[PDB]
Amino acid sequence: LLQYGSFCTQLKRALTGIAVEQDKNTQEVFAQVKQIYKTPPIKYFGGFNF
Amino acid sequence: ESNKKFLPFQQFGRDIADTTDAVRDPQTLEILDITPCSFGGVSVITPGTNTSNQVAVLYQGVNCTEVGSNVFQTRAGCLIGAEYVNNSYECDIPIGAGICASYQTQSQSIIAYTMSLGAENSVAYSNNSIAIPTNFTISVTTEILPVSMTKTSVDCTMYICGDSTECSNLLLQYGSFCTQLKRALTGIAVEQDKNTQEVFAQVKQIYKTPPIKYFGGFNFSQILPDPSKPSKRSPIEDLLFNKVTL
Amino acid sequence: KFNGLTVLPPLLTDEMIAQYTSALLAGTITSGWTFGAGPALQIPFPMQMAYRFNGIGVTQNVLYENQKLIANQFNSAIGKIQDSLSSTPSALGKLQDVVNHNAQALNTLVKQLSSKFGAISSVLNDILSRLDPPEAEVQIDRLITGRLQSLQTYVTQQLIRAAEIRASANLAATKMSECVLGQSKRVDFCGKGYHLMS
Amino acid sequence: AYRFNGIGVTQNVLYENQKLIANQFNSAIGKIQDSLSSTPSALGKLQDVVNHNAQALNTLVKQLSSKFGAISSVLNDILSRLDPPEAEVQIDRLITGRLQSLQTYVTQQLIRAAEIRASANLAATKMSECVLGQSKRVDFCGKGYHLMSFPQSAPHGVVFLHVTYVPAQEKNFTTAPAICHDGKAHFPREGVFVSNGTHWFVTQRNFYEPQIITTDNTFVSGNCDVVIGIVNNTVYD
Ligand SMILES: *[C@@H]1O[C@H](CO)[C@@H](O[C@@H]2O[C@H](CO)[C@@H](O)[C@H](O)[C@H]2NC(C)=O)[C@H](O)[C@H]1NC(C)=O
Ligand SMILES: *[C@@H]1O[C@H](CO)[C@@H](O[C@@H]2O[C@H](CO)[C@@H](O)[C@H](O)[C@H]2NC(C)=O)[C@H](O)[C@H]1NC(C)=O
Ligand SMILES: *[C@@H]1O[C@H](CO)[C@@H](O[C@@H]2O[C@H](CO)[C@@H](O)[C@H](O)[C@H]2NC(C)=O)[C@H](O)[C@H]1NC(C)=O
Ligand SMILES: *[C@@H]1O[C@H](CO)[C@@H](O)[C@H](O)[C@H]1NC(C)=O
Ligand SMILES: *[C@@H]1O[C@H](CO)[C@@H](O)[C@H](O)[C@H]1NC(C)=O
Ligand SMILES: *[C@@H]1O[C@H](CO)[C@@H](O)[C@H](O)[C@H]1NC(C)=O
Ligand SMILES: *[C@@H]1O[C@H](CO)[C@@H](O)[C@H](O)[C@H]1NC(C)=O
Ligand SMILES: *[C@@H]1O[C@H](CO)[C@@H](O)[C@H](O)[C@H]1NC(C)=O
Ligand SMILES: *[C@@H]1O[C@H](CO)[C@@H](O)[C@H](O)[C@H]1NC(C)=O
């Protein structure tokens, strides 16, 4: 198989790029805010149920 | 040992993937299961060579028993050469499920930790209170977007056969792949030109700024073209063109 | 665990995504759309809803004189959501399609290893234990070519799928930016009707 | 001033703070060059295209040295050492390998060109919507309240400079939904009711500027016994 060439390098590069892109997708979608906000202990909002 | 109920006439055992997983001993009738031996990949975690030469090794998806601070089991595998701490920082080098690695002075070493999502904040919500701003700030931000790429063309005869007539005659038998290749490359080049044409040719008029550069106190000298230099580019454009180099 | 095929875990766990969602919900509940452009500013919820009605062309007295009815309607609509999701058989087919496609591709790639590709056998050990070097390469070459072709096809299919996945992720990010952190005036972009919040 | 009016701030806010805004804009513009120069990977997106193209071309060129199960990888050596009848067997494998390499290169180029076209379309939309006008879409032309944008050209790409307005120095206040007077409810026309602790005013959205409550900035529209949390106080004429 060594005689054929360097197809496996291209395959590994493609797979690694796909994995990095998959991580970046979630990072872009969900990491919008830089602060972790918390709801008040009293759950009254003028009659609205959440 | 196997808990597989072999009827008195089977000898082997297969799965969905159609691979052998059970076998009976010819000498003593007993069913035994076969499992593949452990295998995996090795990743090397290191900072820049300018900083230090220390490294850490991650065996992906492996229990640490099979392979000082060389022992630490993560969901991504076994980590060797890093120390784990209770503390949480912004992620520097991703490793696995919420585990990151960094080079810290602590002396200098490589540590592993759980990534932190941000700083905890709690707004004092009330149903008779409000918050109103009293002052403002002007901010400027930058964004970078690619537009086009390089246009290339390929010749079949020179690349494959060079100047060999016999090779060209042999290749002629295969068909008309080269026509498809040339069509694809030409379409790519035309699309590359059209991208820039669509992006930049928005206006049909060439407007010029007045000679007197007064706009109520606003400075636009950093983005306006510089007549002193030959290519007539702004200093920011000069920096951008100098930074990007093959 | 297959033959040289491994599955890598994602960087972010489900708990971290849940924490991000909870933080976004708390911010949009307690501060409205102020936290999406700067510091978070406190405001009572009925006043925020009145401002949102003012954003679609309805005066505030319409809300302030119908608060209980609006609250009851919102509560009923929220309550119906779980039943609507549970009753529908194919409500979440989009998320199941990705898993089905990945499993099918992996199964096909694994099953392709049993082909002979015009050779005496599909097992290398049988060829090695029954023959000698000089005549083994002829049988080995066809297997090598077939497996290389299968790998190339799998990689091309994976790239083609990843492109569409990226497009969907970009659309989802845009929707999260424009419908959750603010009020949108684009028609049929954040629901059907006059958008209020998300 | 018109652009500030487009985000919900009155013109007198600009006309009374022109010098401060100009100085802030000048400082923000000046910091841009240093920010671009100091960052090591600020322009990695433009370098990635060049790197990928160079790598693909280098791989395609290097693939020419493979034998593909033949005696040699040079056609001239085969031609000068052999005769027609036995040369085709060696030539065919080289032909097949080079054809496969060319097909792979073309497929990769098409796949990359698709993403390049998508990025170009996004850039064109951003240029149309953020430079030639003022956008109300959240987080489309920067972070904050969009004011304007400036375009710049770069090797194989474009750079957008977005100017945005950010509030700061907030303060606590006590508010009410409506004001009761003479058995009539009152709602603000634009703004919100506010109280410093002893007196009631009406203020605008994103800048604290209290005003005397008057019939010229409020409307009655209803009665006092329907609104929840109403606070009663005098209204002047
Ligand atoms: C908000 O809605 C939830 C969901 O209906 C309410 O929870 C219900 O409360 C009643 C009364 O205590 C129980 O009988 C139900 O079993 C609860 N349902 C569930 C799913 O737990 C909740 O009470 C509502 N909030 C308020 C303040 O009324
Ligand atoms: C709004 O913020 C600006 C920015 O800080 C303030 O301007 C500064 O004010 C301080 C206080 O005297 C001065 O020392 C600085 O020289 C000012 N900077 C500039 C660029 O002029 C401004 O005072 C703030 N406004 C209010 C009402 O607090
Ligand atoms: C607009 O800003 C530019 C950039 O700071 C100013 O140019 C500077 O001018 C001073 C005074 O002549 C020089 O000492 C600096 O060397 C200049 N900088 C550069 C990069 O050339 C320019 O003066 C400003 N415009 C006005 C009207 O003040
Ligand atoms: C590693 O092997 C030990 C041996 O008992 C076991 O207790 C442990 O759970 C294993 N770890 C993993 C991650 O499987
Ligand atoms: C890490 O830090 C906290 C600090 O009190 C500790 O309680 C926690 O259990 C630690 N986790 C470990 C040692 O795994
Ligand atoms: C909200 O208003 C109610 C009046 O029904 C009051 O009881 C409650 O304390 C208020 N909320 C807070 C956080 O004070
Ligand atoms: C507004 O009131 C809350 C509750 O007391 C307080 O935490 C916050 O600091 C106040 N805002 C400012 C700007 O001080
Ligand atoms: C609130 O504003 C009124 C109107 O000018 C003023 O008389 C009063 O002193 C102010 N109260 C405080 C606490 O500043
Ligand atoms: C004004 O408000 C006070 C406090 O709520 C209340 O006691 C009083 O009755 C109100 N005035 C009238 C005329 O109802």
Numbering used by the authors:
A (entry chain C): 753 to 802
B (entry chain A): 554 to 620, 639 to 677, 689 to 828
C (entry chain C): 854 to 1051
D (entry chain A): 903 to 1139
What does the primary publication say about this deposited structure?
The Omicron XBB variant likely originated through the recombination of two BA.2 descendants, BJ.1 and BM.1.1.1 a progeny of BA.2.7516. XBB harbors the substitutions R346T, N460K, and F486S, which were convergently acquired during Omicron evolution (the mutations in the non-S region are summarized in Supplementary Fig. 1). XBB.1 is the variant most profoundly resistant to BA.2/5 breakthrough infection sera to date and is more fusogenic than BA.2.75.
There was no major movement in the overall structure of the S2 subunit in the two closed states. However, some differences were observed in both the S1 and S2 subunits in detail. As a major difference between closed-1 and closed-2, the cryo-EM map around the fusion peptide (residue: 828 to 854) was highly disordered in closed-2 but well observable in closed-1. This suggests that in closed-2, the fusion peptide could not adopt the stable conformation observed in closed-1 due to the movement of the SD1 domain. The cryo-EM map in closed-1 showed a higher resolution, and the RBD was well packed, while that in closed-2 showed a relatively lower resolution in the RBD than in the whole map, suggesting that the RBD region is mobile.
